[PDB]
Amino acid sequence: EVETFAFQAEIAQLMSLIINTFYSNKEIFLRELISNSSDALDKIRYESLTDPSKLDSGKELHINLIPNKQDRTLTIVDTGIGMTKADLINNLGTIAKSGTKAFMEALQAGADISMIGQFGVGFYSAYLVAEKVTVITKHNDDEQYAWESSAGGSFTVRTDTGEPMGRGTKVILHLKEDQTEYLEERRIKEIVKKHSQFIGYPITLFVE
Numbered sequence: 097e098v099e100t101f102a103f104q105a106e107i108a109q110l111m112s113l114i115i116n117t118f119y120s121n122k123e124i125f126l127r128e129l130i131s132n133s134s135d136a137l138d139k140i141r142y143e144s145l146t147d148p149s150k151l152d153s154g155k156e157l158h159i160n161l162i163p164n165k166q167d168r169t170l171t172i173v174d175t176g177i178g179m180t181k182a183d184l185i186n187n188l189g190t191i192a193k194s195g196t197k198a199f200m201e202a203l204q205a206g207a208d209i210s211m212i213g214q215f216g217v218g219f220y221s222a223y224l225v226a227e228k229v230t231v232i233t234k235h236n237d238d239e240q241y242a243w244e245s246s247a248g249g250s251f252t253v254r255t256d257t258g259e260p261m262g263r264g265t266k267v268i269l270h271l272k273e274d275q276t277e278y279l280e281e282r283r284i285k286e287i288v289k290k291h292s293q294f295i296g297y298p299i300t301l302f303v304e
């Protein structure tokens with residue numbers, strides 16, 4: 097059973113801007129996703145100080161980057177806090193609406209795409225390089241869900257029956273045809289070194 101939801105207008109506009117604006121420095125998408133993973137890992141870490149039981153779903157806190165040329169996907173996996181169904185449908189868009197308006201304020205008033213992360217909506221930079229984004233996520237006390245969107249104003253949520261995750265998030269980037277460079281090891285390495293070198297969690301770049 098797949099449910100289909102409309103993005104809030106403001107979020108749909110943001111996604112259209114990202115997809116349509118001429119902007120050659122597409123590589124910033126990876127730092128934004130890794131940053132989001134790091135924040136999610138911080139979050140489970142501090143929540144589990146006043147509730148150790150939140151770590152029963154997994155104690156390891158790390159990030160995997162997994163390229164698959166056969167599927168043409170780049171997956172950013174973390175064991176962070178993950179996201180509830182209530183997050184995926186409502187709470188994320190509630191928070192993102194304000195940060196989206198600030199970001200588009202600055203885009204005309206002293207800014208370029210590369211500061212999208214300072215307004216909490218860096219996730220949507222994924223559409224610089226991905227034609228479709230699939231997000232698998234598992235939060236404590238909720239089930240595992242698959243969120244999916246190829247933009248166009250809508251997204252889907254379903255219960256995930258695939259490989260169970262324990263706790264965390266997988267962002268699966270289905271790369272555009274002309275963006276397979278982000279499957280190449282040298283390229284991913286270069287980008288992580290340039291923009292993500294001081295993240296306080298292990299980042300494992302899988303090979304192949």
Ligand SMILES: [Mg+2]
Binds near residue numbers: 189
């Ligand atoms: Mg929305």
